[PDB]
Each structure stands twice: as structure tokens, then as C-alpha cells.
């Protein structure tokens, strides 16, 4: 049991695909060994979480998990639960001499404007010791006080070519034999989503044979 979604997750910023503008800017922050609070904006599955993790790794080295946490801001128990979690993580010093800790907050734009103000307090309460990376689908859905407190990064849909080239790399690494039409079927099914595509590729490969379009629809009927 191995999940290729994780085995083939970007380990460094250069390994994120289809977001070159954002990556160049982000790499300059690692060069300077510091980030401001960050707002990542774009369609689901474009790699916002992946680039946050790749940034943490570049910033902190192999012990990055010690100083990085992920949580969903739209927790069904309300903003005060999320805010409590943030307090707990924040109140110990960074581990291993890292300059700060990173909190990735997913789906921050599903917060009401009230919750967002609440969350903006907590964010300010910890600005020296922690850095926040907020994820959202639309900038316009994040309150102005948060927008101006952050460097903004707009993620774009990843092009078919970029997905194709990456899936091929993964096939090469795992010794998967896939036909041309199999690869086209896999891209079709992806819907632009790398997680869906890689999951399907792993299931198709587990069969043990040449992967074609029929194997793709078979995997996908059993989703």
C-alpha cells in the first residue's frame, strides 16, 4: 500500500507544473529565507496545496513537517474550533531552529465575512512566529483586510500538455506501459484534476497489464 498521489507529490517548487509565474516569485522567497503571509487563489485541483507543501520543504529542509500544519478553514464546527487549533499549534516555538511555522488554511473563502474577521485576528495575534497560507477559489471572496495582509498568487488551470508530460514521467518511474489512446482516455477522465488522474493511473497499473482506454473506463466504473 503506497499512494502515488503522495509518492509523486512535488518535493520542491520546481516540481510543480503549470504555474510558472507563481513558482518563480515563490522561489525568490526561498532564496531570501522568508515569506510574508500568503494568499493562494485558483480553481480546485490546480496545485495550491501541493505548492504550499513544496514551499515548506524548500524553506525548512527534510524536517519540514515539524513546522507545518494543514487544516480546513470550513470545518463544520465553526471558526472558533479552527481558531483553537491554530492557537495550539502556534504556542510552541518553531522546532529545529526554523525561523517560523507555517499554517496552511484550505477553503478560507467558504468563511462568512464574520468568521474571516475572527480569523484575521488570530492571524495578527501570531504574525511573528507563524506564517499563514490561505487557500481560496476566488480572491473576491476574501475580505479586504486579509487580501492586503497577504502576498497574492493566482493559480491557473493546468494545460493538457502539462498533465500529459507529468503522467508520462510517473509511468516511466513505475514501469507502466500505457498506449497512446489509454493516455488520452486517462486525460479525458481527469477533468483537469491531477489527483483523480494519478489515482486512476495507479488502479489501472495494479491490474498488471498494458493500460489502454478500456482499462481506464474499467477503473473509472469501479470508482
Q: 53 by DSSP, 3-state: which?
A: helix
Q: Which does 198 bind (CB under 5 to 8 A by kind): ligand ANP, Mg ion, none?
A: ligand ANP
- Residue 110 in the binding site for ligand ANP (CB under 6 A): no
- Residue 49 in the binding site for ligand ANP (CB under 6 A): yes
- Residue 16 in the binding site for ligand ANP (CB under 6 A): yes
* Residues of this chain, 111-140, that bind ligand ANP according to CB under 6 A: 135
- Residue 195 in the binding site for ligand ANP (CB under 6 A): yes
CA angle in degrees (0–180, nearest 5) for 158-160-166:
80
* Stretch of residues binding ligand ANP (CB under 6 A), selected from 63-71, 92-100, 171-179, 194-202: 194-202
Contact 134, 73 (CB under 8 A): yes
Pairwise CA distance, residues 180 & 222, whole Å:
22
Residues lying near Mg ion in the complex (CB under 5 A): 44
In the chain the beta strands, taken as DSSP E runs, fall at 38-41, 68-72, 101-106, 130-136, 151-154
| H-helix segments, 103-223 | 113-125, 144-147, 160-174, 180-190, 194-206, 213-221
Report the nearest approach of ligand ANP to the CB of residue 71 (Å): 13
- Is 101 assigned to a binding site? no
- Residue 104 in the binding site for ligand ANP (CB under 6 A): no
Pairwise CA distance, residues 110 & 8, whole Å:
29
Report the nearest approach of Mg ion to the CB of residue 92 (Å): 28
Per the annotation, where are the binding residues for ATP? 42-49
Which parts of this chain interact with ligand ANP (CB under 6 A)? 5, 8-10, 16-19, 44-50, 135, 158, 166, 194-195, 198
Amino acid at each position: 500500500f503506497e499512494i502515488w498521489v503522495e509518492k509523486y507529490r512535488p518535493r520542491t517548487l520546481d516540481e510543480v507544473v503549470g504555474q510558472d509565474e507563481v513558482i518563480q516569485r515563490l522561489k525568490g522567497y526561498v532564496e531570501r529565507k522568508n515569506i510574508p503571509h500568503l494568499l493562494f487563489s485558483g480553481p480546485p485541483g490546480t496545485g495550491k496545496t501541493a505548492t504550499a507543501i513544496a514551499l515548506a520543504r524548500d524553506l525548512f529542509g527534510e524536517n519540514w513537517r515539524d513546522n507545518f500544519i494543514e487544516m480546513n478553514a470550513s470545518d463544520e464546527r465553526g471558526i472558533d474550533v479552527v481558531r483553537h487549533k491554530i492557537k495550539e499549534f502556534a504556542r510552541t516555538a518553531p522546532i529545529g531552529g526554523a525561523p517560523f511555522k507555517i499554517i496552511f488554511l484550505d477553503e478560507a473563502d467558504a468563511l462568512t465575512a464574520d468568521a474571516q474577521a475572527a480569523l484575521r485576528r488570530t492571524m495578527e495575534m501570531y504574525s511573528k512566529s507563524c506564517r499563514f497560507i490561505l487557500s481560496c477559489n476566488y480572491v473576491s471572496r476574501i475580505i479586504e483586510p486579509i487580501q492586503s495582509r497577504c502576498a497574492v498568487f493566482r493559480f491557473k488551470p493546468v494545460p493538457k500538455e502539462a498533465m500529459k508530460k507529468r503522467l508520462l514521467e510517473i509511468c516511466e518511474k513505475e514501469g507502466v506501459k500505457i498506449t497512446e489512446d489509454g493516455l488520452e482516455a486517462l486525460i479525458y477522465i481527469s477533468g483537469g484534476d491531477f489527483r483523480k488522474a494519478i489515482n486512476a493511473l495507479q488502479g489501472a497499473a495494479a491490474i498488471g497489464e498494458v493500460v489502454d482506454a478500456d482499462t481506464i473506463y474499467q477503473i473509472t466504473a469501479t470508482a
